[PDB]
Structure 1
Amino acid sequence: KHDYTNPPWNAKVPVQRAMQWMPISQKAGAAWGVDPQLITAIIAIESGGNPNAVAKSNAIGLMQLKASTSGRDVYRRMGWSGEPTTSELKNPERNISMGAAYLNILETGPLAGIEDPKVLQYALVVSYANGAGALLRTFSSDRKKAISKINDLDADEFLEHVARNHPAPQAPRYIYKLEQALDAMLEHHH
């Protein structure tokens, strides 16, 4: 169904800009047990490495995180009242910390129990894009059964499932863009 490779996405310059933040991605990723390569890919795809980014519904900063939803979710999990400010989300360090936190919330929460780390990666970017609920309900109304079904697929099969069945066109497209970004990041390791 979704023609998710059209138009081509050229990752080179988004990735070069995102790579300048790799020191922070590495630190925050370690701190949250999140993959720095996935953080960097998300930065490239979301802000293209611009820490002053503004997006969809005033999502802000390098990872284009929304204060009142995702940001709040991170503060809740931290036992903090409230939610981040706009100026906190424009701070690269704070932005990437919170985005890593949010990725950890998804991995250890709705997506808990996915055993293939590559399928987990794909599920994480689909869930970051359009929410874990929309993804899981393409499998089952029951979380546990959804996860069980996800665990029977490999990564190619999971993409094909998302491409045929997810209602959001952005969902398979985020997997395509993730792989364009991971390929482009290879040029920066010697």
Structure 2
Amino acid sequence: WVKDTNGFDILMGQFAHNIENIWGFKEVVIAGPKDYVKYTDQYQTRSHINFDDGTITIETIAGTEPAAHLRRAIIKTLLMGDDPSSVDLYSDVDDITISKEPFLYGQVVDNTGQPIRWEGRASNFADYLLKNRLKSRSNGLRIIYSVTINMVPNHLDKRAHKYLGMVRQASRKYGVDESLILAIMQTESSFNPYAVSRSDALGLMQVVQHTAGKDVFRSQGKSGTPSRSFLFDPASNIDTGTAYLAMLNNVYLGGIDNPTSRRYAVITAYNGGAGSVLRVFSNDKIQAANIINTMTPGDVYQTLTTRHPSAESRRYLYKVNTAQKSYRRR
């Protein structure tokens, strides 16, 4: 709903085209919801954090002094403070800033098994990787040099720890279970505060500003739509996303009486839309709820997990439900 979207659409096209020219079409890698990718060095160097499987891969296709290119990115990535509102993952500008509290602190250790919070240890660790873990690849035409760093095994729990207070607040406020909130959050970004989709979802809970964002503001009697900075603010984001979860539950899918059937529906609707979920059972929103209110919740899970028209949405329900079963028990 803007020229913000369109100016941003073009920047996207422009950004991707700059990468394509240097890495070749098959090597175009871009930041995602569960993936931080930051280009530096005029697109010759990229720093990739895969939050889903816990790897930090630093790459360069620079032909001169590649080891030097890699060292610079390794240290900054390990030391970067998170203020995702200030980071542009769609430019090659170095807006990377070193703070007293690196975002990755406790998620990775150096080769001596210690967490990294100072520039000295990060440097010693970079030199070690460069001497013992330097890999080289061919894209068919030119050499890419890299360093892979594995995060601690429990990196996901360590990263979610940063947002449990915000989840507890939003949970008590909106009447939505903590386990559902975390399960949505995990499935959407693996607790990545730099999360960006190409469906315009922003932040930890992947809030689409123009649909869900706008809707939530209205529900609370607020005007306008949430800014880009607002949704990259973790507390703002988790509050907004949880509000949309409660909205799906009270108004859009409220005709569902069994609370466990409603959840399956709410979860699916979070990704694919409330409209589509009802339309699986009947074109009449009222009849659709009436059919659901006569079937067991396990049929409802089974119905949505197979007979929903988006392949993405069918997977989404299975993923969130799985995630929730490990957050629900305390």
TM-score (norm 1): 0.86
2:278 counterpart of 1:136: yes
Shift of 1:156: 1.7
Residues 33/138 of structure 1: CA separation in 2 closer, same or farther (3 Å cut): same
Runs (5+) with no aligned partner, structure 2? 1-51, 54-153
Kindly indicate whether the alpha-carbon contact (under 8 Å) linking 2:216 and 2:244 is maintained by their aligned counterparts in 1: yes
In the TM superposition, 1:51-130 aligns within 5 A as 51-130=193-272
Secondary structure of the 1:24 match is: helix
Cα deviation 1:98-152 (Å, max 9, x = unaligned): 0111111111112013222211111111000100111111111111111111112
Residues 25/87 of structure 1: CA separation in 2 closer, same or farther (3 Å cut): same
Shift of 1:16: 5.3
In the TM superposition, 1:1-190 aligns within 5 A as 14=156, 17-185=159-327, 189=330
TM-score (norm 2): 0.51
Question: Which of 1 and 2 has greater Rg?
Answer: 2
Kindly indicate whether the alpha-carbon contact (under 8 Å) linking 1:21 and 1:40 is maintained by their aligned counterparts in 2: no
More strand by share: 2
Cα deviation 1:70-105 (Å, max 9, x = unaligned): 100011112211100111001111001101111111
- Which runs of structure 1 show a deviation greater than 2 angstroms over 4 or more consecutive aligned residues? 12-20, 182-187
Matched AA of 1:163? T
Residues 16/126 of structure 1: CA separation in 2 closer, same or farther (3 Å cut): farther
Secondary structure of the 1:34 match is: coil
The higher relative CO (CA closer than 8 Å, separation ≥ 6) is in 1
Secondary structure of the 1:140 match is: coil
RMSD: 2.0
Task: State the aligned residue count.
Answer: 179
- Partners of 1:178 and 1:19 lie apart in 2 by 19
Q: Percent identity?
A: 37
Matched AA of 1:107? N
Question: What is the match of residue 19 of structure 2?
Answer: none
Question: What is the match of residue 4 of structure 1?
Answer: none
More helix by share: 1
